[PDB]
Design an enzyme around this catalytic site. Structure first.
Site, short mmCIF file in Angstrom:
data_model
loop_
_atom_site.label_atom_id
_atom_site.label_comp_id
_atom_site.label_asym_id
_atom_site.label_seq_id
_atom_site.Cartn_x
_atom_site.Cartn_y
_atom_site.Cartn_z
N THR A 16 0.80 -1.21 0.00
CA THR A 16 0.00 0.00 0.00
C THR A 16 0.84 1.27 0.00
OG1 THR A 16 -0.20 -0.15 2.39
CG2 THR A 16 -2.01 -1.03 1.07
N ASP A 39 5.95 -11.02 -28.52
CA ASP A 39 7.08 -10.09 -28.43
C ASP A 39 8.22 -10.57 -29.35
OD1 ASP A 39 9.24 -8.35 -27.08
OD2 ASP A 39 7.45 -7.82 -25.91
N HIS A 69 14.19 -7.83 -25.45
CA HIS A 69 12.96 -7.20 -24.96
C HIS A 69 11.93 -8.24 -24.50
CE1 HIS A 69 9.04 -5.11 -25.63
NE2 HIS A 69 9.67 -4.04 -25.20
N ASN A 161 4.71 4.82 -25.18
CA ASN A 161 5.76 5.63 -24.57
C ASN A 161 5.90 7.01 -25.22
OD1 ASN A 161 6.38 3.28 -23.06
ND2 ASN A 161 8.20 2.83 -24.27
N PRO A 175 -10.78 -0.69 -26.45
CA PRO A 175 -11.35 -0.55 -25.11
C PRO A 175 -11.44 -1.84 -24.31
CG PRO A 175 -12.62 0.70 -26.70
CD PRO A 175 -11.66 -0.11 -27.48
N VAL A 177 -9.60 -4.53 -23.90
CA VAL A 177 -8.42 -5.14 -23.29
C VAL A 177 -7.99 -4.30 -22.09
CG1 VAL A 177 -7.80 -6.23 -25.47
CG2 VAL A 177 -6.77 -4.02 -24.86
N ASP A 200 -6.58 1.57 -18.29
CA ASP A 200 -7.28 0.85 -17.22
C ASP A 200 -6.54 0.88 -15.89
OD1 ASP A 200 -9.63 -0.66 -18.64
OD2 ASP A 200 -7.89 -0.96 -19.94
N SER A 224 6.22 -1.11 -21.78
CA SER A 224 6.51 -2.52 -22.01
C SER A 224 6.84 -3.28 -20.73
CB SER A 224 7.71 -2.71 -22.93
OG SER A 224 7.42 -2.45 -24.28
N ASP A 260 -2.75 7.43 -5.61
CA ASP A 260 -1.42 7.53 -5.04
C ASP A 260 -0.35 7.95 -6.03
OD1 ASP A 260 -2.53 6.77 -2.57
OD2 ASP A 260 -2.38 4.66 -3.14
CA LIG Z 1 -9.94 -1.39 -21.19
#
Ligand SMILES: [Ca+2]
Ligand SMILES: O=[Se](=O)([O-])[O-]
Ligand SMILES: [Ca+2]
Ligand SMILES: [Ca+2]
Ligand SMILES: [Ca+2]
Length: 279
Positions: A16, A39, A69, A161, A175, A177, A200, A224, A260
Site C-alpha cells: 500500500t 514479443d 525485450h 511511450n 477498449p 483489453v 485501465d 513494455s 497515489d
Molecule cells: Ca480497457
C-alpha cells in the site's frame, strides 16, 4: 511468501506504500495458469525460467530472442527472481524481429494464434496474453486484440511511450483489453507514459530489473515493463480463483491502490496495480 530484496516493482505491487523492497504473495504463484508473451521471443534456457518457458510460435527464421525485450518482459511475468507469477507457464510468440519491429499483419496473426493455441495447452487456472508493443491507430490491430480477449484470454497491452493520449495507438486504444500505463518508484507517472481515458491501470515501468538474453539481467524502462506486471498479476489472481480472464482487468482496477500517483492528467485513472495479499 516473502521475497526479500525484490525488484522495486514487485515490492510495489504487494504494498500500500512506495519505498519498500520485499515482495509478498501467495505461494500458489500462478501455478496452473499460462501467460503468452507476444514479443521478440523468450530465451527459455535462462535459469530464471526454471523450465517453465517455451517458444510456441515464430514468424521469422528463428524462435530465438535475438533482442532481449521479450525475455525481459517474460521475466517480469514469471521468472523466479524478477517475476510476479513465479510458477506460471510462459509461452513465447515471436511477432517482433530481433530489431524489435513487426508488421501489423504479423502481430494480428500472432494474436489469432494465441486465441487458438490455448486450446492446445493445459491452463486450468486460465490464460493471459501480454503485448508490450504497439504503433499508430489501427482498427484491424484493435479488433485482433478484442477477439483474443473475447476468446477467453486476459489481454494486457502497453499504453505506449509517447507521453500522449493512448487513443491514437494500437492495441492500446482497444477498449475491451487491459491498457497499462507506467509509474516510477516514487509513484510518479513515468515521464514517457501515455495516458488518457482508455487506460485501465498503471504498473511499475521505470527502471525495472529483469532477465535478458545471454543468461543475463538488466534494468530498462517502458510501458513494455509495466504491462507484464499486470499480466503476471492477472495470472496470479486467476490461480487464486479471485477473478477470471474476462473480468480480471476490472478486478485489478477495483482492487488497485487509488489516488497515489502523481502527474496523472485530469481524466486518466489514478490506479496502481496491487495484489492485496494479506498473510
Ligand atoms: Ca480497457
Ligand atoms: O530498487 Se531496484 O534494485 O532498482 O529494483
Ligand atoms: Ca531455432
Ligand atoms: Ca493529447
Ligand atoms: Ca467500461
Amino acid at each position: 511468501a516473502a521475497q526479500t530484496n525484490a525488484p522495486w516493482g514487485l515490492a510495489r505491487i504487494s504494498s500500500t506504500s512506495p519505498g519498500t523492497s520485499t515482495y509478498y504473495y501467495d505461494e500458489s504463484a500462478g501455478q496452473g495458469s499460462c501467460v503468452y508473451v507476444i514479443d521478440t521471443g523468450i530465451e527459455a534456457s535462462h535459469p530464471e525460467f526454471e523450465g517453465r518457458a517455451q517458444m510456441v510460435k515464430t514468424y521469422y527464421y528463428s524462435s530465438r530472442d535475438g533482442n532481449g525485450h521479450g525475455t525481459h518482459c517474460a521475466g517480469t511475468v514469471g521468472s523466479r527472481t524478477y517475476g510476479v507469477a513465479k510458477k506460471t507457464q510462459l509461452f513465447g510468440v515471436k511477432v517482433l524481429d530481433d530489431n524489435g519491429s513487426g508488421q501489423y499483419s504479423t502481430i494480428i496473426a500472432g494474436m489469432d494464434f494465441v486465441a487458438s493455441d490455448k486450446n492446445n495447452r493445459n491452463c486450468p487456472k486460465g490464460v493471459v496474453a501480454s503485448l508490450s508493443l504497439g504503433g499508430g491507430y489501427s482498427s484491424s490491430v484493435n479488433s485482433a486484440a478484442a477477439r483474443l480477449q473475447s476468446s477467453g484470454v486476459m489481454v494486457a497491452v502497453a499504453a505506449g511511450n509517447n507521453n500522449a493520449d493512448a487513443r491514437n495507438y494500437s492495441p492500446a486504444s482497444e477498449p475491451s483489453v487491459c491498457t497499462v500505463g507506467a509509474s516510477d518508484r516514487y509513484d510518479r507517472r513515468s515521464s514517457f507514459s501515455n495516458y488518457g481515458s482508455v487506460l485501465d491501470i498503471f504498473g511499475p515501468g521505470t527502471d525495472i530489473l529483469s532477465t535478458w538474453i545471454g543468461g543475463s539481467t538488466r534494468s530498462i524502462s517502458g510501458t513494455s515493463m509495466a504491462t507484464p506486471h499486470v499480466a503476471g498479476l492477472a495470472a496470479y489472481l486467476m490461480t487464486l480463483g479471485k477473478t477470471t480472464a474476462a473480468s480480471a482487468c476490472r478486478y485489478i482496477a477495483d482492487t488497485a491502490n487509488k489516488g497515489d500517483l502523481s502527474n496523472i492528467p485530469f481524466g486518466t485513472v489514478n490506479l496502481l496495480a496491487y495484489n492485496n495479499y494479506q498473510a
